[PDB]
Amino acid sequence: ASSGPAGCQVLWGVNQWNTGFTANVTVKNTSSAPVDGWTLTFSFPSGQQVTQAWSSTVTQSGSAVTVRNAPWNGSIPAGGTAQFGFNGSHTGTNAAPTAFSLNGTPCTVG
């Protein structure tokens, strides 16, 4: 990025039992723009493949990931946060990498 995109932040709230790990994610935008929905992107290192989802249009591309949060569940002003969750299965390894990337801008984990 030869300019100065955003740099929001998304935290993770995992909650698994035998292997299925839920994921309570909370976005945090502090850049400086009216976030009326968005599409972040990154990927799952281990075999973390999401299945269910709400308040977030998740999409696993082979092994990577992307989430198009609807406009309603994504109507937060540059000074606020958003939140969504899903249920993915794994095998016991590393999931949430680090700084994902909003639709056109980076985003450091929370």
PDB file of C-alpha atoms in Angstrom:
ATOM      1  CA  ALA A   1       0.000   0.000   0.000  1.00  0.00           C
ATOM      2  CA  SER A   2       1.765   3.129  -1.211  1.00  0.00           C
ATOM      3  CA  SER A   3      -0.461   5.518   0.718  1.00  0.00           C
ATOM      4  CA  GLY A   4      -2.044   4.904   4.117  1.00  0.00           C
ATOM      5  CA  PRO A   5      -5.044   2.593   4.270  1.00  0.00           C
ATOM      6  CA  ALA A   6      -6.768   1.633   7.506  1.00  0.00           C
ATOM      7  CA  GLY A   7      -5.492  -0.531  10.353  1.00  0.00           C
ATOM      8  CA  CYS A   8      -8.441  -1.813  12.327  1.00  0.00           C
ATOM      9  CA  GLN A   9      -8.126  -4.683  14.717  1.00  0.00           C
ATOM     10  CA  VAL A  10      -9.956  -7.967  15.235  1.00  0.00           C
ATOM     11  CA  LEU A  11      -9.830 -10.074  18.361  1.00  0.00           C
ATOM     12  CA  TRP A  12     -10.616 -13.762  18.719  1.00  0.00           C
ATOM     13  CA  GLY A  13     -12.776 -15.622  21.213  1.00  0.00           C
ATOM     14  CA  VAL A  14     -12.250 -19.331  20.597  1.00  0.00           C
ATOM     15  CA  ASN A  15     -14.344 -21.881  22.440  1.00  0.00           C
ATOM     16  CA  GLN A  16     -13.931 -25.539  21.452  1.00  0.00           C
ATOM     17  CA  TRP A  17     -14.835 -28.810  23.095  1.00  0.00           C
ATOM     18  CA  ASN A  18     -13.593 -32.001  21.434  1.00  0.00           C
ATOM     19  CA  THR A  19     -12.403 -30.335  18.260  1.00  0.00           C
ATOM     20  CA  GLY A  20     -15.100 -28.017  16.988  1.00  0.00           C
ATOM     21  CA  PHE A  21     -13.982 -24.551  18.013  1.00  0.00           C
ATOM     22  CA  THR A  22     -16.356 -21.683  17.990  1.00  0.00           C
ATOM     23  CA  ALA A  23     -14.970 -18.247  17.271  1.00  0.00           C
ATOM     24  CA  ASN A  24     -16.182 -15.027  18.817  1.00  0.00           C
ATOM     25  CA  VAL A  25     -14.635 -12.269  16.729  1.00  0.00           C
ATOM     26  CA  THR A  26     -14.851  -8.571  17.462  1.00  0.00           C
ATOM     27  CA  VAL A  27     -13.679  -5.955  14.997  1.00  0.00           C
ATOM     28  CA  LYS A  28     -12.210  -2.616  15.999  1.00  0.00           C
ATOM     29  CA  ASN A  29     -11.932   0.170  13.480  1.00  0.00           C
ATOM     30  CA  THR A  30     -10.018   3.273  14.502  1.00  0.00           C
ATOM     31  CA  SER A  31      -8.808   4.479  11.133  1.00  0.00           C
ATOM     32  CA  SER A  32     -11.164   7.365  10.290  1.00  0.00           C
ATOM     33  CA  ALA A  33     -14.055   6.308   8.004  1.00  0.00           C
ATOM     34  CA  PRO A  34     -17.742   5.337   8.226  1.00  0.00           C
ATOM     35  CA  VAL A  35     -17.610   1.547   8.188  1.00  0.00           C
ATOM     36  CA  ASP A  36     -20.901   0.573   6.548  1.00  0.00           C
ATOM     37  CA  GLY A  37     -20.081  -3.069   5.955  1.00  0.00           C
ATOM     38  CA  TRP A  38     -16.810  -4.570   4.733  1.00  0.00           C
ATOM     39  CA  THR A  39     -14.842  -7.552   3.542  1.00  0.00           C
ATOM     40  CA  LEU A  40     -11.671  -8.581   5.361  1.00  0.00           C
ATOM     41  CA  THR A  41      -9.370 -11.311   4.235  1.00  0.00           C
ATOM     42  CA  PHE A  42      -6.634 -13.613   5.423  1.00  0.00           C
ATOM     43  CA  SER A  43      -6.245 -17.344   5.869  1.00  0.00           C
ATOM     44  CA  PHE A  44      -6.327 -20.240   8.284  1.00  0.00           C
ATOM     45  CA  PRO A  45      -2.808 -21.604   8.949  1.00  0.00           C
ATOM     46  CA  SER A  46      -3.746 -24.999  10.311  1.00  0.00           C
ATOM     47  CA  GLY A  47      -6.760 -26.952   9.110  1.00  0.00           C
ATOM     48  CA  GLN A  48      -9.250 -24.489  10.580  1.00  0.00           C
ATOM     49  CA  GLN A  49     -12.255 -24.714   8.268  1.00  0.00           C
ATOM     50  CA  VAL A  50     -15.257 -22.677   9.352  1.00  0.00           C
ATOM     51  CA  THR A  51     -18.762 -24.054   8.831  1.00  0.00           C
ATOM     52  CA  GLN A  52     -21.507 -22.112  10.566  1.00  0.00           C
ATOM     53  CA  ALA A  53     -21.603 -18.332  10.741  1.00  0.00           C
ATOM     54  CA  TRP A  54     -23.686 -15.372  11.775  1.00  0.00           C
ATOM     55  CA  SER A  55     -23.392 -11.619  11.464  1.00  0.00           C
ATOM     56  CA  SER A  56     -20.630 -12.301   8.992  1.00  0.00           C
ATOM     57  CA  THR A  57     -20.578 -13.720   5.534  1.00  0.00           C
ATOM     58  CA  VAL A  58     -17.539 -15.937   5.961  1.00  0.00           C
ATOM     59  CA  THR A  59     -16.025 -17.729   3.000  1.00  0.00           C
ATOM     60  CA  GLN A  60     -13.201 -20.267   3.017  1.00  0.00           C
ATOM     61  CA  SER A  61     -11.290 -20.198  -0.242  1.00  0.00           C
ATOM     62  CA  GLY A  62      -9.659 -23.634  -0.279  1.00  0.00           C
ATOM     63  CA  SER A  63      -7.518 -22.871   2.765  1.00  0.00           C
ATOM     64  CA  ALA A  64      -7.670 -19.110   3.082  1.00  0.00           C
ATOM     65  CA  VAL A  65     -10.555 -17.054   4.442  1.00  0.00           C
ATOM     66  CA  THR A  66     -12.666 -13.958   3.884  1.00  0.00           C
ATOM     67  CA  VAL A  67     -15.651 -12.349   5.642  1.00  0.00           C
ATOM     68  CA  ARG A  68     -18.131  -9.990   4.170  1.00  0.00           C
ATOM     69  CA  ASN A  69     -19.918  -8.519   7.140  1.00  0.00           C
ATOM     70  CA  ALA A  70     -23.345  -7.312   6.139  1.00  0.00           C
ATOM     71  CA  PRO A  71     -24.137  -3.581   6.250  1.00  0.00           C
ATOM     72  CA  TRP A  72     -26.334  -3.838   9.351  1.00  0.00           C
ATOM     73  CA  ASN A  73     -23.957  -5.893  11.458  1.00  0.00           C
ATOM     74  CA  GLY A  74     -21.222  -3.685  10.064  1.00  0.00           C
ATOM     75  CA  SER A  75     -22.497  -0.127  10.498  1.00  0.00           C
ATOM     76  CA  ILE A  76     -19.834   1.161  12.889  1.00  0.00           C
ATOM     77  CA  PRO A  77     -18.257   4.662  12.635  1.00  0.00           C
ATOM     78  CA  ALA A  78     -14.474   4.897  12.220  1.00  0.00           C
ATOM     79  CA  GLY A  79     -14.462   5.171  16.029  1.00  0.00           C
ATOM     80  CA  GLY A  80     -16.151   1.948  17.095  1.00  0.00           C
ATOM     81  CA  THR A  81     -16.257  -1.838  16.741  1.00  0.00           C
ATOM     82  CA  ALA A  82     -18.158  -4.649  15.073  1.00  0.00           C
ATOM     83  CA  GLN A  83     -18.645  -8.302  15.908  1.00  0.00           C
ATOM     84  CA  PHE A  84     -19.452 -11.673  14.425  1.00  0.00           C
ATOM     85  CA  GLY A  85     -18.936 -15.366  15.110  1.00  0.00           C
ATOM     86  CA  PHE A  86     -18.744 -18.811  13.530  1.00  0.00           C
ATOM     87  CA  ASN A  87     -18.099 -22.507  14.211  1.00  0.00           C
ATOM     88  CA  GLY A  88     -15.099 -24.191  12.592  1.00  0.00           C
ATOM     89  CA  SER A  89     -13.405 -27.555  13.111  1.00  0.00           C
ATOM     90  CA  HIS A  90      -9.698 -28.207  13.556  1.00  0.00           C
ATOM     91  CA  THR A  91      -7.178 -30.718  14.878  1.00  0.00           C
ATOM     92  CA  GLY A  92      -5.383 -28.703  17.567  1.00  0.00           C
ATOM     93  CA  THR A  93      -2.960 -26.127  16.157  1.00  0.00           C
ATOM     94  CA  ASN A  94      -2.648 -22.427  15.274  1.00  0.00           C
ATOM     95  CA  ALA A  95      -5.656 -20.504  13.958  1.00  0.00           C
ATOM     96  CA  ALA A  96      -5.982 -16.713  13.968  1.00  0.00           C
ATOM     97  CA  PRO A  97      -2.687 -15.685  12.313  1.00  0.00           C
ATOM     98  CA  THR A  98      -1.943 -12.014  13.016  1.00  0.00           C
ATOM     99  CA  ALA A  99      -2.731  -8.877  11.024  1.00  0.00           C
ATOM    100  CA  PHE A 100      -5.511  -9.805   8.652  1.00  0.00           C
ATOM    101  CA  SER A 101      -6.713  -7.310   6.077  1.00  0.00           C
ATOM    102  CA  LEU A 102      -9.968  -5.397   5.896  1.00  0.00           C
ATOM    103  CA  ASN A 103     -11.451  -4.810   2.457  1.00  0.00           C
ATOM    104  CA  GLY A 104      -8.393  -2.877   1.169  1.00  0.00           C
ATOM    105  CA  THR A 105      -6.578  -2.271   4.482  1.00  0.00           C
ATOM    106  CA  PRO A 106      -4.544  -4.155   7.123  1.00  0.00           C
ATOM    107  CA  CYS A 107      -5.985  -5.135  10.525  1.00  0.00           C
ATOM    108  CA  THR A 108      -3.879  -6.212  13.555  1.00  0.00           C
ATOM    109  CA  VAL A 109      -5.369  -9.047  15.623  1.00  0.00           C
ATOM    110  CA  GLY A 110      -6.882  -8.033  18.979  1.00  0.00           C
TER     111      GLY A 110
END
